Design a protein around this motif. Structure first.
Motif, PDB file in Angstrom:
ATOM      1  N   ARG A   1       0.837  -1.198   0.000  1.00 25.37           N
ATOM      2  CA  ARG A   1       0.000   0.000   0.000  1.00 25.37           C
ATOM      3  C   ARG A   1       0.870   1.245   0.000  1.00 25.37           C
ATOM      4  NH1 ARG A   1      -3.291  -4.488   0.582  1.00 25.37           N
ATOM      5  NH2 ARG A   1      -1.734  -4.963  -1.034  1.00 25.37           N
TER       6      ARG A   1
ATOM      7  N   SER B   1      -1.172  -7.309  -9.033  1.00 28.10           N
ATOM      8  CA  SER B   1      -0.766  -6.573  -7.817  1.00 28.10           C
ATOM      9  C   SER B   1       0.717  -6.131  -7.792  1.00 28.10           C
ATOM     10  CB  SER B   1      -1.071  -7.401  -6.571  1.00 28.10           C
ATOM     11  OG  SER B   1      -0.105  -8.450  -6.483  1.00 28.10           O
TER      12      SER B   1
ATOM     13  N   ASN C   1       2.797   2.165  -7.514  1.00 24.77           N
ATOM     14  CA  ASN C   1       2.664   2.796  -6.240  1.00 24.77           C
ATOM     15  C   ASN C   1       4.018   3.230  -5.667  1.00 24.77           C
ATOM     16  OD1 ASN C   1      -0.415   1.096  -5.186  1.00 24.77           O
ATOM     17  ND2 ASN C   1       0.003   2.748  -6.638  1.00 24.77           N
TER      18      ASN C   1
END
Length: 247
Positions: free
Chosen positions: A22, A116, A123
């Protein structure tokens, strides 16, 4: 993924098991393809400097990621950062750190096998990723290439042989990495690399990888149509070889 055996199969099992991340991306998407092309037009040698602490084809080097990146920033058309854990001792952190310190384009090199891991690249600041044909079904390879593009990324497609290349052309690769080093045997064949290169359309950005070690090679390969050059372990050992190499 494809049907596999040995060290390869083991990387792909771990990669499938690899925990997502994250985080918010805090840089723009800087295209590697576009900057390679600028360098060509600008008649500057395009060297892509790899960061890796360990590889199956070298001795381990302990070295600061950031110090390396900041140094290469003056010279390289872009950086490859390994983030595969087992075989290369890399981390997402190397990516994050280096991504917050330089603004040249960054390709994350891992054995990418699920969306992912593409989310993580994005990210973390990676400008693009390596998609490995030897590892993916046609379907998966097409699927993850589309997905990388949804974020704005233009992935490099890594190849070894005529089958690889034919599948890269199938998906319409815009950037192709031609590696001379076989994933399994670690055999280097430069003759096979040269032929692969001759068989690739002009409109496709061609990057030669593995095995390159001197300006004459780079010069020979440029005459053959090669655009840029992935150079790894020797730059890890001796980062200032790149000033020699870019003449």
């Amino acid at each position: 993924p494809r049907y596999l055996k040995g060290a390869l199969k083991d990387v792909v099992q771990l990669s499938l098991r690899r925990p997502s991340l994250r985080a918010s991306r805090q840089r723009p998407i800087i295209s590697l393809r576009e900057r390679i092309l600028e360098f060509n037009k600008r008649n500057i040698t395009a060297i892509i400097a790899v960061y890796k602490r360990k590889s199956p084809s070298g001795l381990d080097v302990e070295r600061d990621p950031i110090e390396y990146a900041k140094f290469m920033e003056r010279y390289a058309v872009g950086l490859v950062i390994l983030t595969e854990e087992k075989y290369f001792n890399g981390s997402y952190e190397d990516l994050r750190k280096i991504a917050s310190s330089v603004s040249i384009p960054i390709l994350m090199w891992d054995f990418i096998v699920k969306e992912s891991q593409i989310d993580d690249a994005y990210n973390l600041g990676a400008d693009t990723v390596g998609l490995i044909v030897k590892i993916l079904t046609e379907r998966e390879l097409e699927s993850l290439l589309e997905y990388a593009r949804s974020y704005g990324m233009e992935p490099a497609i890594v190849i070894n042989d005529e089958e690889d290349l034919d599948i890269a052309l199938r998906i319409g690769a815009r950037i192709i990495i031609i590696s001379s080093r076989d994933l399994e045997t670690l055999e280097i064949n430069k003759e096979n690399q040269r032929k692969l290169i001759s068989m690739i359309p002009s409109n496709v950005v061609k990057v030669a990888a593995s095995g390159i070690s001197e300006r004459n090679e780079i010069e020979e390969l440029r005459k053959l149509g090669v655009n840029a050059f992935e150079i790894g372990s020797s730059l890890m050992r001796n980062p200032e070889k790149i000033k020699e190499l870019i003449l």
